[PDB]
Amino acid sequence: SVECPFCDEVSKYEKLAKIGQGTFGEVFKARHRKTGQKVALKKVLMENEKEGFPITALREIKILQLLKHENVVNLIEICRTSIYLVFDFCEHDLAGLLSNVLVKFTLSEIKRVMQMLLNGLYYIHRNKILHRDMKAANVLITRDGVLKLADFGLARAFSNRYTNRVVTLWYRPPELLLGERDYGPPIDLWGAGCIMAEMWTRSPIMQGNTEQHQLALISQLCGSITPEVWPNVDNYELYEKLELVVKDRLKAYVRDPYALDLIDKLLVLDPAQRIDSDDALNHDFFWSDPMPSDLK
Amino acid sequence: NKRWYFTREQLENSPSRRFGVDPDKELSYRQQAANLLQDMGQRLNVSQLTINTAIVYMHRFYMIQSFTRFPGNSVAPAALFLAAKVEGQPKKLEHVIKVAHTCLHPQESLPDTRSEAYLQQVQDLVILESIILQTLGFELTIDHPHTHVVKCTQLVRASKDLAQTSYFMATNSLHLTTFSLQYTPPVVACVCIHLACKWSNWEIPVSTDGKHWWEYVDATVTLELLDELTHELLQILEKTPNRLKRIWNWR
Ligand SMILES: Nc1ncnc2c1ncn2[C@@H]1O[C@H](COP(=O)(O)OP(=O)(O)OP(=O)(O)O)[C@@H](O)[C@H]1O
Ligand SMILES: [Mg+2]
């Protein structure tokens, strides 16, 4: 047997339940054998993998080790025996809570959520990382009411020939559907737009089936994609496939004008006119009554 | 935090020392691994940054494991294989095996990719990558002196020549010394730039404030440590055949 000072055996933790399925293995809830601290064990398995340890897993591990912030999932350590990513345990998730007709948010609370969300984005972009998988199912909340950005399995660093088929279809921004590959932080902010609208509607606002269907559903919410709306949107190649020619559609569900104004600035077609996490945190929404409040 | 930094005494009591390996012998095993890394790396067409990263893996790896148990010729390929995935220039396992083999055995020829012998050595590498990740505690993000050299050398407008020589010293510090186990990268950078200046007979002028060039690179750096360190690096440079020739002024 070979010395291993810095990689502890996962027996350290006591397993309590499967709680999900991963890309390389099962995910468990579990408990520190000594202190009872609750953690999520997310296994990584090397059998179907032909190039040794998955490059894609290494990237996630690299990214998680770098991002240390109140509003981003915390990778505690890696454990052996196979390999497990050990996370701080997070009881709920935005998607599940939104699905639950039993659970109800005040305006004061929804604001706080959007705040922690936008603050996690401010942080990860400031550290040159794109999330790329923005969706309600990837926003976690702990028992103490703290929102964590989670699941960085699609995340990558940045500084211009980046991959295209990223972000689940419903949350994917116009520019990616239009074939863009020089995108930045704004794709995550579009996602924060759909997640925010989702906070009232309780239902993903733009549910597509194909890329041309989503890109159309988008137009029938944000207006047609025209160079008057999006300076130089012509240059894009795929712009010759299915043409066509927002506050009123959400007017019903939301009601609050500020909430509505911000969601309009988040769901903007031109990625360079879409609001950033910085200006959004400053937007009146977070600074007018009722102020943002903690979670119960 | 100061986990991968070691004292001169911890460097003496290395895992290799337990199993009988002389101090001087160990320094060589490190240099030969470094060499094999650079050879494999140029053939595989990866960057110096990848090679550097693999070299630091090697260095750390043998502060925990022993050369008597894991031979540099086995560990170097796997380390480079990892480093290339981590640095975004992934090379295929079959590919690293083929190149590792030609470097170690220029004459022999690769076994049949169908055989039980080749199928084995592919698994040995895959197993060794796993042993490396665990030894390093999955800490794969490595900071190199170079980043910081290239910062300073511009903010003192060094000649293109002086800058190249600094990069040179930086890389050669990874092959020839154990500085990366003892001194932070910005300090190693100062050592590299200091020696490069002494060697090119170039004097960097005391900035307007009164501070020396280095104080703009690391608050801990003293000229006493800079002189001590350049002397060490210079000495091993002189023992290394043909190296200094590369930066020597023949004119
Ligand atoms: N730190 C954590 N605390 C609590 N639950 C977690 C944690 N991490 C993951 N989970 C749960 O694990 C499940 C799936 O995890 P994960 O996102 O890694 O796999 P996935 O389904 O492939 O995700 P995606 O499809 O977004 O890539 C989710 O239902 C989530 O609630
Ligand atoms: Mg998920």
DSSP string, A185-243: THHHHHHHHHHHHHHHHSS-S---SSHHHHHHHHHHHH----TTTSTT-TT-GGGGS--
- Amino acid symbol at B76: A
Tokens of B159: 């000649």
Return phi, psi of residue A261, to 5°.
Answer: -65, -45
Asked if B248 is an interface residue toward chain A (Cβ–Cβ < 8 A), one would say no
Distance of CA A67 to the CA centre of its chain: 14
Min distance A127 CA to chain B CA atoms (Å): 15
Strand bridging mode A92-93 / A75-79 = unpaired
Q: Least CB-CB distance to A5: which of B64, B93, B138?
A: B64
* B89 Cβ under 8 Å from any chain A Cβ: no
CA-A135 nearest atom, ligand 1: 26
Cβ contacts of B164 within 8 Å, gap of 6 or more: none
The CA distance from A239 to the nearest CA of chain B, in Å, is: 32
CATH, domain range B142-251:
1.10.472.10
CB atoms within 10 A of CB B154: 10
d(CA A26, CA B39): 40
- Could you say which DSSP state residue A172 is in? -
In a 10 Å sphere around its CB, with 0-12 CB exposed, 13-18 middle and 19+ buried, how is residue B182 labelled?
Answer: middle
Q: How far is B2 from chain A (nearest CA, A)?
A: 13
| Domain B1-141 top-level CATH class | mainly alpha
Which residue from A19, A23, A146 has its CB within 8 A of the most atoms of ligand 1, so it is best to mutate?
A19
Could you tell me which residues are beta bridge partners of residue A83?
A: A44
* Mutation to test the B interface, candidates A1, A4, A6, A45, most B Cβ within 10 Å: A6
> What is d(CA A129, CA A62) in angstroms, rounded to the nearest whole number?
11
Residues, beta carbon < 5 Å, ion ligand 2: A 137, 151
**Helix or strand holding residue A75 (H, E):** strand A75-79
Half-sphere exposure of A294 (CA within 13 A, CB side): 5
Biggest CA-to-CA distance, chain A: 69
Choice from A24, A27, A140, A166 to test ligand 1 binding pocket (greatest atom count within 8 A of CB)? A27
Please report which residue ranges of chain B form alpha helices under DSSP H. 8-12, 15-18, 23-44, 48-61, 72-86, 93-104, 116-135, 145-152, 160-176, 185-199, 223-239, 243-247
Beta-bridge partner residues of A85: A42, A78
Distance A139 CA to ligand 1 centre (A): 10
Exposure letters B116-145 (e unless 16+ CB within 10 A, then b) = eebeebbeebbebbbbbbbbbbbbbebebb
In angstroms and rounded to an integer, the radius of gyration of the C-alpha atoms of chain B is 19
CB contact under 8 A, A61 and B3: no
**What does residue B2 show for φ and ψ, rounded to 5 degrees?**
-115, 30
Question: Would you say A280 and A262 are in contact if contact means Cβ atoms under 8 Å apart?
Answer: yes
How many residues does the structure list for chain A?
A: 296
Domain with CATH 1.10.472.10 in chain B: 1-141, 142-251
The response to whether A53 counts as a known ligand-binding position is no
Q: How far apart are CA B147 and CA B165, in angstroms?
A: 14
- Residue A118, judged by CB atoms within 10 A of its CB (0-12, 13-18, 19+), counts as buried
Question: Was A182 annotated as part of a binding site?
Answer: no
Which residues have a Cβ under 8 Å from the Cβ of B34 and sit 6 or more positions away?
B55, B58, B174, B175, B176
What count of CB pairs under 8 Å joins A to B? Answer: 58
DSSP one-letter code for A25: S
Separation CA A282–CA B1 (nearest Å): 36
Instruction: Please state, in angstroms and rounded to a whole number, the distance separating the CA atoms of residues B235 and B247.
Output: 15
Residue nearest to atom 19 of ligand 1 (CA): A22
- Contact (CB, 8 A) for A9 and A80: yes
Q: Which of A24, A39, A41, A42 is the pocket-test mutation for ligand 1 (most atoms within 8 Å of CB)? A: A42
Q: How far apart are CA B7 and CA A276, in angstroms?
A: 47
Q: Cα(first)–Cα(last) distance of chain B, in Å?
A: 47
- Ligand 2 centre and the CA of A151: distance in Å? 6
Q: How many CA atoms lie within 13 A of A150 on its CB side?
A: 23
Q: Three-class SS of residue A156?
A: strand
Indicate the angle between helix axes A247-254 and A186-201, nearest 10 degrees.
50
Give first-to-last CA distance, chain A, whole Å. 49
- Which residue is associated with the tokens 């008057």? A228
Shortest-distance Cα residue to atom 17 of ligand 1? A151
- Name the method of structure determination: X-ray
After what residues is chain A interrupted, C–N > 2.5 A? 81, 159, 245
DSSP letter (8 states) at residue A72? B
CA of B48 to the centre of ligand 1 (A): 37
Domains of chain A: 1-91 (3.30.200.20), 92-296 (1.10.510.10)
Which stretches of chain A are DSSP H helices? 55-66, 94-99, 107-126, 174-177, 186-201, 211-222, 247-254, 257-266, 277-282
Please choose, from the candidates B151, B129, B149, the residue with its C-alpha nearest in 3D space to the C-alpha of residue B140.
Answer: B129
Contact present, B154 and B162 (Cβ < 8 Å): no
- The token pair at B212 is 């020396």
Which residue in A8, A133, A264, A276 is the catalytic one?
A133
Q: Do B86 and A65 touch (CB under 8 A)?
A: no
Residues paired with residue A140 on neighbouring β-strands, in sequence order: A93, A148
Q: How many Cα atoms occupy the beta-carbon half-sphere of B22 within 13 Å?
A: 3
Atom of ligand 1 nearest to the CA of A148: 1
Q: State how far the Cα of B6 lies from the Cα of A111, in Å rounded to an integer.
A: 49
Asked if B140 lies within 8 A of A53 by C-beta distance, the reply is no
> Are the CB atoms for B187 and B221 separated by under 8 Å?
yes
Q: Is the peptide bond before A290 cis (omega within 30 degrees of 0)?
A: yes
- At residue B222, the 3 state secondary structure works out as coil
C-alpha A98/C-alpha B4 separation (Å) is 46
B17 in Cβ contact with B26 (< 8 Å) = yes
Instruction: Quote the DSSP letter at residue A146.
Output: -
Q: Is B138 left (phi over 0), alpha (psi -120 to 50) or beta?
A: left
Contact criterion met (CB < 8 Å) for B64 and A3: yes
A18 ligand 1 Cβ < 6 A: no
Q: Which residues lie below 8 Å from residue A145, measured CB to CB, with a gap of 6+?
A: A294, A295, A296
Is A278 a known active-site residue? no
CA nearest to A265, candidates A253, A247, A250, A252: A247
**φ, ψ for residue A149 (rounded to 5)?**
-65, 135
- Distance, in Å, from the CA atom of A275 to the CA atom of A190, rounded to the nearest integer, reads 9
Residue B97 CB-half CA count within 13 A: 22
Facing A61 at nearest CB: one of B64, B81, B138: B138
The CA–CA distances, whole Å, from B229 to A73, B6, B122, B157 equal: 42, 16, 41, 24
| Distance, CA of A24 to CA of A153 (rounded, Å) | 11
CA–CA distances in Å: residue A225 to residues A180, A229, A263, B199: 14, 7, 18, 62
Question: What is the 3-state composition of chain A as percent helix, strand, coil, each rounded to the nearest 5?
Answer: 35, 15, 45
Spatial separation of the C-alpha atoms in residues B150 and B131, rounded to whole Å: 34
Give exposure, A137-176, as e/b (b: 16+ Cβ within 10 Å): bbbbbeeeeebbbbbbbbbbeeeeebeeebbebbbbbbbb
Contact A232, A219 (CB under 8 A): no
Contact between residue B167 and residue B146 where contact means Cβ atoms under 8 Å apart: yes
Spatial contact of B243 and B215, defined as CB atoms under 8 Å apart: no
CA distance A104 to A94: 12
Enumerate the residues of chain A whose CB falls inside 8 A of the CB of residue B93. 50-52
CA of A79 to the centre of ligand 2 (A): 21
